[PDB]
Paper text:
The Vesivirus [name] (FCV) belongs to the family of Caliciviridae which carry a positive strand RNA genome which is enclosed in a capsid composed of 180 copies of the major capsid protein forming an icosahedral T = 3 shell. In contrast to the other genera, Vesivirus [name] is synthesized as a precursor (668 residues for FCV) which is processed by the viral protease into a 124 res. leader peptide and the 544 res. Feline Junctional Adhesion Molecule-A (fJAM-A) was identified as a cellular receptor for FCV. We observed that the majority of the FCV VLPs obtained from the expression of [name] in the baculovirus system are small sub-viral particles made of 60 subunits with T = 1 symmetry different from viral capsids.
The crystal belongs to the cubic space group P213 with a cell parameter of 358.3 Å. It became obvious that here was no electron density for the N-terminal 37 residues which correspond roughly to the NTA domain. In the T = 3 capsid these residues are involved in inter-subunit contacts interlocking the shell of [name] capsid proteins. [name] forms a closely packed shell without any significant openings. The particle has an outer biggest dimension of 295 Å at the position of the spikes, whereas the shell extends only to a diameter of 185 Å. There is no indication that the structures of the S and the P domains differ from the corresponding ones from the T = 3 crystal structure of the viral particle. But in order to adapt to the T = 1 shell, the relative positions of the S and P domains change from the ones observed in the T = 3 structure. The structural adaptation to the two types of particles involves a hinge movement between the [name] S and P domains resulting in a slight rotation of the spike around its 2-fold axis which is combined with a translation of the P domain relative to the S domain. A comparison of these different oligomers in the T = 1 and the T = 3 structures confirm the conservation of the contacts within the oligomers. The conservation of the arrangement of the [name] capsomers around the 2-fold, the 5-fold and the 3-fold icosahedral axes between the native T = 3 virus particles and the T = 1 VLPs shows that the antigenicity of the protein is conserved and that the use of the T = 1 particles for vaccination is a pertinent approach.
Residue numbers in the entry:
A (entry chain C), D (entry chain O): 161 to 662
B (entry chain K): 161 to 341
C (entry chain E): 233 to 341
């Protein structure tokens, strides 16, 4: 019928899990006006610049005649932001019961300062829901008793109409919706500190990483392009023995080579020892911890905590066969190698095949990345003292009841056989976008992303205004890895990201 | 729209916890007439000296289809003060069920001796609620079994309008609301 | 010819053309006259609002000439006139002297 | 005004370069009906399933009062496909002059068999343009005299309206528009046979490649996932010396490991010779060709044409240090290594650190990819005899006046210093899609893609129904590499892809 059928039916937006353990007064939908709500509108809005009117919002719950409880509805005017307190209720509101099978549908009228709302106006009328009266249940007791879900649909109000038709091509002055970061599919994900695909999650209280990490304003504390490619550096043949300290050749960070690893040696170690031990091979898996016993040991081997990497030797004047490569970042005074945490154009050591005293100079070329030195079960990047900052220290603490995560990756080792992994802050594909794009997100509203395994388990992940990953569970566990994700939008970080995991 | 939007929507007033251990007949809202009810009115009243008409009162409970019980509603005329006894019920009343999801909204009509109510008149019409029939619950037993809450909103009746406009500064003869200690 | 809505700034690339446009020929002796409709966020535009509707022109198809060869072959000029639209009217009458909050046009250096 | 402003103005579609050397009668717009034309419609159509009516088409040329020539317009009914012959004109047509400054605008009325057109119906009314009378120019002479361009816009006809509103989520039965393959940006492109970013184009008459190559029907002659990751194989320690022949561990091709290189040794060579020569180092660049002279030589070094790759050794029972890796695919009868072209679960050789006669077995683990053996200026994959087929031989000859290309990549070498490159068939990101998606394209209509450097140069690339890259120039040259692409749609491969390069 009408060429505007969407301007008629209802589209789903989001839904939340109202738990019986959720104390009186607690926000549930900080959702605000603006065509960013409904997807159709949001899509259509790509062709205009002007919007006005309101948006109807139908939503309901599936309460059982047993339950009892009431939800509140309040239309927050522009310029104010709702707080998760009670006082919010000393405001004209609309009570709402859990039994009511009839889904409620009211409208968020647009009160405006201007005539027409510029696409980007993030300051508009808003509506919210708060648990008036707790959710009671006749068979209380232990654990998270229960709690039903609540959905929320959306339909463009009647009085809602656009206005200014933009001419195609004239780049948008603001930024697209952040619901386009993580790829819907677990397959191609891969860490940002290491080119391996993720295979697990890390529930932590703190997170820190600058190398290849990008901010939401496109800025980056880092020192390297959001991609993994070979590292080409020119080192001046020392004539004596191993040297290090070789400045890069072509990178978007004066000195500090784009692609150069992350951490540094956790102790004033020296460069030497052939196949330096860490004892017992064949004695596979008798070893994790602190060397397990006297005979059997867990860590030494001289150049420990070193980044292994194939490498093509230059030749300058002459002499062949690549041969080595063992790197990191620290000060190379003498034949020692004290660790620096601050990274500058004077801390890039390596190992070589220099040789011959004519003092032939400017050796090598390139080297990649393959492994690292088996420092026990230390998932690289778990301590500030080990992460190398260029100046600043990008991080994030537990905002709201949410906790920060990492992305348990996997890093091959050498001397041993094959093992150990390493964390990760941003799913590579993300950073990639961050740097190449430019969005808009409230410094208090994450970027709700749904994750789901192959059974039923599912949880949400958020994105910090800085660019980190958050979770609403105290601990997550094992789940079928044929994972796939999705995007919801934004929600005040002050609310937990529900999940049906465990 | 109307420069009097408050004279339209409902504002919260107070709410109480109706427990299943609360014996038959027990007051819950000794609340009385007078602009002191709704905050908007109460605030606006600061500019007048005269008020009249009634005030509508919407309020409800969130009962579960399981529960059973009835609440009573009674409009106590001025000059009398409700007692927490049963006999109160041998008076025209309006029964009320815990299941009813529909929130009730009736009015407290202003019966008056005078023409216009002086701001301070603490002797006016009044409304109250009493637990007609206990609150029963199929899974009784030990401790304070359970008991749901009940809210109460307020909206200025239609026939409610002030009257005498006081000139600013002329100190108020009575006293402000104690909700400021 | 393309009418760029407010909040965006035209780039000297091609993609600009994957937008509703109006082709224009070099032969057409008839001078074209269209309007730049004002789409606005507010009700009335404050004198200083530098963020408004906009129009632009881009060379769709190169300028060809049957006698090519060396040097800057040739190339003709193009003019542009202006007339206040009908629906264009002011609104707030400022009282003299009340210093202007913004700044005069730089065409006076 | 109208919430349907697009249903009013005109949108650009495509334009062509009408040359004065273009002989009488030659198609220029095989364009056919269907919302796939206009982008707005095409986009909107995502929400329906039914469309009907016609589409208006405004387009014109910028002819100079000097020129002379006429273009023809013909509305080809459904079920027939226009031929690039003259006879096409013995059909009711509409003549068209080069001088006419007034842009013509007619409609392609929808004649239909059914009531409503199912989204996928590729058999509908169609319109085309053919050069009635050559393009004449008073100052003829040498070279490609001249020739002006012609554009073509589109606007949804009035009588054009959709019909069936599909419910979201119910996966589309057909396939999206192929205008979404190549990434708009030269940056992240990288070859499909090698993980290096492209840096040049190869104008060739023939093309062949199966490994990591995908068809348009999602099928692949290949033997490996459209991605680059380490190759893990288990080889049975021979006890004697070097072995090879080790079956994979986990790949979607029985035997043939996913990721295993492409070509094989071009001669019955053996496994030996330490730093086997190919003479003169330091004698840099005195050497390309056929060894240049007696003293100086260009190719031998025993294990020539071998794929170099770091590799982590297993250990089975015992004994350490990775150490080697040099691979390819051929039969390993004895200590010889004759080349097989046909690849089966019995042709995967390597080099090792087996040792000790207890006959300790099942050695190694993994190995990656770094280099190859300097076979002169041979851009790997330039001869059928060198490319390894699993059974079939995917390729493409010069369809129409168009020529096939490759993607001159870059592959590091060893013994020398650093040099030589290698071809490539599909821009990786492409194959990636091909395998993960499912589109629709006429076996005679490419996928027009525009390429542009940083000056002005620009040309088009097409996609074969099989999945190859084509060009409309006999030779392309050097151009500023800050390249970026785009997508147009589809055009009968029988037409050349114009370009403003050279």
């Amino acid at each position: 019928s009408v060429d505007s059928e969407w301007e008629a039916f209802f589209s789903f937006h989001t839904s939340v899990n109202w738990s019986t353990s959720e104390t009186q007064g607690k926000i549930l939908f900080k959702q605000a006006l603006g065509p960013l709500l409904n997807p159709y509108l949001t899509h259509l809005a790509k062709l205009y610049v002007a919007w006005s009117g309101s948006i109807d919002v139908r939503f309901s719950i599936s309460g059982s005649g047993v339950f009892g409880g009431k939800l509140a509805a309040i239309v927050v005017p522009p310029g104010v932001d709702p707080v998760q307190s009670t006082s919010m209720l000393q405001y004209p509101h609309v009570l709402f019961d859990a039994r009511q099978v009839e889904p409620v549908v009211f409208t968020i009228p647009d009160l405006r300062s201007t005539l027409y709302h510029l696409m980007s106006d993030t300051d508009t009328t808003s509506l919210v829901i708060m648990i008036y009266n707790d959710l009671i249940n006749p068979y209380a007791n232990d654990a998270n008793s229960s709690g039903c879900i609540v959905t929320v649909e959306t339909k463009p109000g009647s009085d809602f109409k656009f206005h200014l038709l933009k001419p195609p091509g004239s780049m948008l002055t603001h930024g697209s919706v952040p619901s386009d970061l993580i790829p819907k599919s677990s397959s191609l994900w891969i860490g940002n500190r290491y080119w391996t695909d993720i295979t697990d999650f890390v529930i932590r209280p703190f997170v820190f990483q600058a190398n290849r990490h990008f901010d939401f304003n496109q800025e980056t504390a880092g020192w390297s392009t959001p991609r993994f490619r070979p590292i080409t550096v020119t080192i001046s043949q020392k004539g004596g023995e191993k040297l290090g300290i070789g400045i890069a050749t072509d990178f978007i960070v004066p000195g500090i080579p784009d692609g150069w690893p992350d951490t540094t040696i956790p102790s004033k170690l020296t460069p030497a020892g052939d196949y330096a031990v860490t004892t017992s091979n064949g004695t596979d898996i008798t070893t994790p911890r602190e060397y397990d016993s006297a005979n059997e040991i867990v860590n030494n081997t001289n150049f420990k905590s070193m980044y292994i990497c194939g490498a093509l030797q230059r030749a300058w004047g002459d002499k062949k066969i690549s041969n080595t490569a063992f790197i990191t970042t620290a000060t190379v005074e003498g034949n020692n190698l004290e660790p620096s945490n601050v990274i500058n154009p004077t801390k890039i050591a390596v190992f070589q095949d220099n040789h011959v005293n004519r003092d032939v100079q400017t050796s090598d070329v390139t080297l990649a990345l393959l492994g690292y030195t088996g420092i026990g079960e230390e998932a690289i990047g778990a301590d500030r003292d080990k992460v190398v900052r260029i100046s600043v220290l990008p991080e994030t603490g537990a905002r709201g009841g949410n906790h920060p995560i990492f992305y348990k990756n996997t890093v091959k080792l050498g001397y041993v056989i094959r093992s150990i992994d390493v964390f990760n802050s941003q799913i590579l594909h993300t950073s990639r976008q961050l740097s190449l794009n430019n969005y808009l997100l409230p410094p208090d509203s994450f970027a709700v992303y749904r994750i789901i395994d192959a059974n039923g388990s599912w949880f949400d992940i958020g994105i910090d205004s800085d660019g980190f990953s958050f979770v609403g569970v105290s601990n997550i566990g094992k789940l079928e890895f044929p994972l796939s994700a999705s995007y919801m939008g934004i929600q005040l970080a002050k609310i937990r990201l529900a999940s049906n995991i465990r």
